[PDB]
Structures are given as C-alpha cells and as structure tokens.
C-alpha cells in the first residue's frame, strides 16, 4: 500500500532490461538479487541508488579515465595502412576530450576538430569502398552507417551538453565512438 | 482445534 | 522460464521514463514479473505491447489502469458470481465410492461450500453474516471431525486450516474496510482447498 | 475451446470497453493491446481476469500515485506576440491551480474557492483561445475537445460532493491538464 | 594487477555501498556483494554499464525525490500525540510546521529570490521545534533519548546541501535531505 518499491521497477529493471543484450545471464542474477533483496528490505533498492547516485563524482572522474585510455592503440598496400591514421587521429581527438571540455573557447575548438576528423574519416572510408570487389560491401556499407548512427548520436550528444552541463554524456558518447571506430577497422580488415 | 474455536467465537 | 526483450523494446524503454509512465513500471512491471512464470508466452506478447503502446504515447497505461479500478463494481460481481458457482458439480470433486462414512464425508463436505457459496447474499445483513460465521465454523469443526474419522494427505490438513485461518483473518479485515471482494475470493479459496482433499481420496 | 467460458468474462465485460474507448483516440494501441489480451485470453483462459485482480490490489498504490502525478502538475508549466503571450499564461495558470487541488480538497471553503478560481481560469483561458483564434485550422477539434473534459471535469466535482471520493477528482483534473497542453501544442 | 581497469567502480562506488548497508543489513549486503563480484568476475565492466545506465535514469530519481517531498503534506498530522498538555501542545505542532514548510520546497526551489526568502522559515521553524524538544527533553529515559542527537545533525545536513544548491542546482539532494528530516521529525513524536 504504498511505493517504497518504485525504483526496483522504474529504475533497476529497466537497467537489467537494457543490459540483456551485452550479457543475459548477469542481468538476470542480479535482477533475481534485488528482487529478493527488496522483498525483505523495502528501501533498500532506493538507499543503494541514491548511493551510487552520491558518487558522480568519482564515477565521472572514471568515465574520463576510460575516455583517455580509448585512444591509444588497441591491438586487434598504401591504403591498408594510410587509413588507419584518420582512425588513429579520430580517436585521438576523443581522447583528449575530458581535458578540453571546462574550457569553451579550446572546447570550440576540439569540436571543429572532430567534425573535422570524422567528416575526412568519412572520406578516407568512402574513398576506400573502391578497393573491395563491389559485389561484396554488405558488412562495409553497413558498418559506414552504424559508425554513422554514432556519429549521428554523438552530436545530439554534444546539443544536449550546453543545454545540460551534463559532461559524463559526452565522454560517454565519445566512447562509443571509439569502440564503433573499431568496429570500423576490425569490418575494413575482414 | 485452538484456531477453530477461535474462529467460531468470532 | 525468463523474459527476453528485442533491440526495439530495449530502446522504447529507455526513451520512455517521464513520470506519468511510472505505472507501466509500478503496476505493470511486477504483473509481468509474476504471470512470466505461469504464462511466458503472455506475459512476454503483453510486455512487449505495453512497452511500445507506452513509448509512443506517454500517459497510455495510467489511462488503462484508472478505466480498470472504475470498473470495480463489474469485478465484485463477477467475484460474487464464481463464489456462487463454487458448490456446484457435488458429483465429480467428490469420493465415486458409494460407503457408509465415504458418502457422510461427501455429505459434509457438500455443506461448507455451500455455505461459503452464499456469502455474497448473507454478507449484506450483519446479523445474518454473523449467523454464517458462526455456521461456517460448525461446517468446518464438523468437517475436519469426519475425516479424523476416516504423508501427502497431512499437507492438505495443513492447507486446508492455513486457508481456513485466512479465511477469518481477511473476515477481521473486512468488518475494517467494507471490501467484500476481498471475503468472496478468500471463500473462493477455501472452496478449492476443501475441493483439493477429496481429490486425495480419489487418487 | 471454441465455446467462451465464464472465466473470461472480465475480457469483454471490463477490457473491451477499455479498448473500445480507447480506440476513439488511439487505434494501434487499442488495436495492438486487445489483439494481444485476445490472444492471451484463448492460449489461457482466466488470465484476464488474473491481470485485473492483480492491478485491483494496486488500488491504494494507484491512487497516492495520481495525486502526486497531480502535485507534480506544478513543474510542467513551460511545457510546450502578445495574444500569444496571454494564452501561454492564462494556460499556466489553470495547471497550476489544478495542481493545488491536492491541498485545498480537504477543506469546506478553500477548496468552494478554488473551485470557483478553476471555473474563472477555465473561461479565462478559453476566452484567450479565441484571441489567437479570432486574430491570426485543426484547432476546432480541440476546443470541442477541451470545452468536453471541462464538462467532464464539472461532473467530477458534483459527484465528489455526493462521494466524497478524491480520484476520481485528480484523474479528472489530470485529463484536463492534458487537453490543455494539447491544446497548447495545437498550434 | 590481474584485473581489468574497466573493473574499477565495482571497487570505487560498489564496495563503499554494500560496507554502509552491511551497518544495517549484513545479509543484504553479502549476498549483493557476492552477486556482484560474480557478476563483474564473468563479465569485465558490467558494474560500470549498471552504474551508467543508473546515472542515465536520474530524473526518475530527480521526479520520484521531488514527489515523495510534495506527498508529505498528507503526513504532516502523521505521528500527533494523543496526551494533552501545553507541553505536548507546542511540540505537535512546532512538527507539523516543520512537515508543512518542509513540503513546500518544491514549489519554491526555483524562484531562487523567494527561495531565499524561504529559507528562513525553516530555519525558524527548525529553531522553534528544538525549542520545544529543549522544554521536555529533560522534563522525563536513558535507552530513548538519542532522538535528539540526529536532528541535529540531518538539520545541518540540510543547511550545508542547501548551501551546495546554489553552487550545484542539483535540487534532488535538497530533495532527498528534506526527506530525512522529516523523517527524523516524525521519529521523535514516535518515542511517544
């Protein structure tokens, strides 16, 4: 008779829900745990989210940490390798982006550079296509428009950021970029 | 048979 | 024996968090949760439908659940209805055997129900629903008496007073809340349980 | 099983209605839920019935959970020239007096008063519909619409006064608030 | 040494949680801990993904904080004593104020000049409520008592998240601080 509980649904489940594609079995362990949990405890749910909620900081710090880690290189003919770098490059400008973001002018700047850096990512992979037998772009093609999607996001992302002040967005978009950046170089090299 | 009774008394 | 969710639900999910969508994961969501046991197919079809229906018009489910509670009187008849329903068919749930106390038990199990069936109709007149308590307590004293007379067959001892005690648990309820529907569910309960002993009988 | 049985009952005697209201202003919703609740009920029979006992006991849940929604009415009073400019306001105002609803419903007067404080700013805000209607489409249909649940929401009131029950009363005002942000985005 | 850096937050922002709850709920505590140390051992940076998403979500938790504070209105009479007495007269309702003022903060928070403005009524009614605890504190003992140490402090609590609102605009800890004490104030009146 009353909603102690709520966040169990309306914030944890959906949390679990959204996960499942990355691993199914975890996501119903500890859905199962703070099912149970809250069963015996109501309040405990919303005590530990606001918790974590408590600790933004650290958990940005974090985020920026991974961001930075992103860049440098990951391991796994002329344009075999001379399209790496505006891969390399790209994910270099989102790595720096924790350190210019508290700073508008060199942050207008930053932007400028990545919209820069995909937009001539975006060329040196469109001037690529050529070299692939075009019977066979299926995972190519496909791979250009999900990079796209992120890209896409990625500047909605940005919008939003001095509508909100909400830098953790950014950094986490930035590095979706990069993992799609891989995706990317790991489609083109198979 | 306690609750029984119980429940007819009530 | 879990639901799964597609990349589409997944994303209507995330995009749908204003606060008049709270009940589709207030009320909803632990519906779903439950039936996904019972009913995977259902509760995975329906989840899946609530969720988009929600997504594309934020405030969707909220209308539904307050058009279900207006509809309160429609479902303490309905309640009233099966309650009534309840006694009938004496001749299948009963022991096929034609004895001396395996026909009396019969007999006095016919009794309870029937006067758990008429509660709807006594509930009304304070005086006669107290004079239906005290003859429910007569049917049940009298019952568990007949089969004394004549281990799984312990569990359903065991049930049968735990439903028994719930029954009068939510009868002290209702003399706080004037919520019928609770009492004829409750019976309903019972009912079946009392179904359930003869069942044992017959195996 | 081509035959209904009893135990599905609450299908068509509380879902279908629920559906065929609904229908009226949403038909893939409609179309898509009683499809599946079909669905369901045929695999199943008495699942219908399951689901509305379970929403049933979330009753008290329900009802604390509208009024807040109604509160909360208060923070969502930007949401979405000069006879513009009084539009935009005389719309504010009405969602904010409904969103005090919750505090003056317990009293004699207070509550008399702000009763009387709706029906001046639903006229107000009507009369400044017209002062972007009558001077600069799809508009009608809403007014029509609006002007209905302001009726809905006067019957509301009178029946709580015999009931003395509040839901039915934040519902009511919560609809209302949403005819008039759909009003407010009808242009 | 062995475990990734994506690993970190279920050491950074898990741990430190579940060792707060153990003070409460060692069992609860355990078994999410064990939960999630097998989760994350599986699965390197699923607690960061679940942190995310959380943080992803926090205007759930910005509107459900806001409207547990705007519900308290209700509750304000919640806890009254039935003993008569103008000692138990002013304490019944120095608390209800307090609820009721604490309650409209919502509606303030952000008209930030009569938010100021507002401030001050709290405090008041903080002062005036402490007034009357110190007026029967030791009027009656030892095993309920420690009431009166926590008011204290959750109401400075408060001050100081009110001070970090104008620094932040987070008004959610606000939000969550209002909450505490009137729990806290309800807490009190239930000694009795």
Do not use: C, W
Not at chain 1, 78 to 87: G, H, R, T, Y
Not at chain 1, 98 to 112: G, M
Not at chain 1, 160 to 179: C, E, M, P
């Amino acid at each position: 008779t009353s909603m102690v509980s709520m966040p169990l649904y309306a914030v944890m489940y959906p949390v679990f829900n959204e996960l499942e594609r990355v691993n199914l079995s975890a996501a119903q362990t500890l859905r199962a745990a703070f099912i149970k949990a809250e069963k015996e405890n109501p309040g405990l749910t919303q005590d530990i989210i606001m918790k974590i909620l408590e600790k933004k900081s650290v958990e940005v710090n974090f985020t920026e940490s991974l961001l930075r880690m992103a860049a440098d290189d990951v391991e796994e003919e002329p344009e075999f390798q001379d399209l790496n770098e505006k891969a390399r490059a790209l994910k270099q400008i989102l790595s720096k982006i924790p350190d210019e973001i508290n700073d508008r002018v060199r942050f207008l700047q930053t932007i400028k550079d990545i919209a820069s850096a995909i937009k001539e990512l975006l060329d040196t992979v469109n001037n690529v296509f050529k070299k692939y037998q075009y019977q066979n772009r299926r995972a190519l093609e496909h791979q250009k428009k999900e990079f796209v999607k992120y890209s896409k996001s990625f500047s909605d992302t940005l919008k939003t950021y001095f509508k909100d002040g909400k830098a953790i967005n950014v950094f986490v978009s930035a590095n979706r970029l990069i993992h799609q950046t891989n995706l990317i170089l790991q489609t083109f090299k198979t | 048979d306690a609750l029984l009774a119980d429940l007819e008394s009530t």
